[PDB]
Amino acid sequence: QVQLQQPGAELVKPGASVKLSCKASGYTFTSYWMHWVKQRPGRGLEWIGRIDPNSGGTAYNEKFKSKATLQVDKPSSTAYMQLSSLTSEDSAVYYCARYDYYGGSYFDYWGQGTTLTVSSAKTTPPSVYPLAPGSSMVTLGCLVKGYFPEPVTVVWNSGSISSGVHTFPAVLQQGLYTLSSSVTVPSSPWPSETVTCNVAHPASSTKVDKAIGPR
Amino acid sequence: QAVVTQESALTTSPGETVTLTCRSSTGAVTTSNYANWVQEKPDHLFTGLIGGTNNRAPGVPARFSGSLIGDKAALTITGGQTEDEAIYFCALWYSNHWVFGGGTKLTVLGQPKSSPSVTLFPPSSEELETNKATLVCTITDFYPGVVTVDWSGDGTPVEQGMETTQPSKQSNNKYMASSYLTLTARAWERHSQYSCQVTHEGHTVEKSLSR
């Protein structure tokens, strides 16, 4: 029942600043230190600093003292970290981790991290292309090419086909995302009966349905 | 960063003992470095296990212990379990700041090795109409979760215009991944052989297509 909750993602433009939140529940907020860690899948984890909710006591990584600011709000039991003068280099997942300090010295519970994307790129709808072969059994796909920002939702036949499908994570080249979804069906249903992928990209108020036709 | 270093990756089996280590570049890891060991399982699920070198964090399995070995910090897992397959991070304290290590990806053989299922997709003529060609190569059902995905154009290795996703855990606990090779329609009209090569556990496999 010890829990730390962090928003899933946040989009911001360079030069802006954000205020990440970490809701604490399941324990007495004031008797545990709270730490913030930055992760850029690429070159690991970096310790930002720590704040003592009880005394307001603060401790920052020298490399982050002009970049971050930590505080908390006791009544709501939530810790905050504001990042300023945002840049692309600030893009990453930010975690809040609960910390015990007594005759102890730990990091026990961690929130799940808020992935911050700092980019001045324009909202771009995805181009949905059918993935078919040209000679269970047959594997069909959908390419969701060049969109921004994330995310996009991919379903098959509105959610009629749920197993055999593999929706891969997005790769990013050029400041534009791309991913693809696969669904394997018996060589009987296709092309006999129909298979369709439904791609939704709310950010661009777009939605595309592609029937996968024989090649 | 102040630089703590760990074993890149290690492999064990259910019921065995495996030990992970942690180096400080300054010198011998000491009790004053308050070594911390953290676990990261699929979908950024981080959990502290050990603090202050050997203090087990409440609500952590007894099979996890911490210590020093030579001039390094150690995380010992006795009687390894399938669920222990995850990434382990070391964290040392240097007077006024914490420094994490790169993390050790631990594999706990908990199931049979499963060869990769590879599918190569040609570019859609819809995408070809805009003048662009994208080759899609999906790789699924492999275990352990390490594969090397290479691209070839006319039997020649390709580095640029290619992105690969880091292996992903499937529902059935096996792994999956995908690779993309982007070309201009014109650059795709002049070459004939296109192949996605996947190396897994010392075994190589290809899926090719000739426009």
Partner: peptide
């Protein structure tokens, strides 16, 4: 080169 405990730790 850093290290130890302190009143910050």
């Amino acid at each position: 080169y850093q290290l130890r405990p302190n009143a910050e730790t």
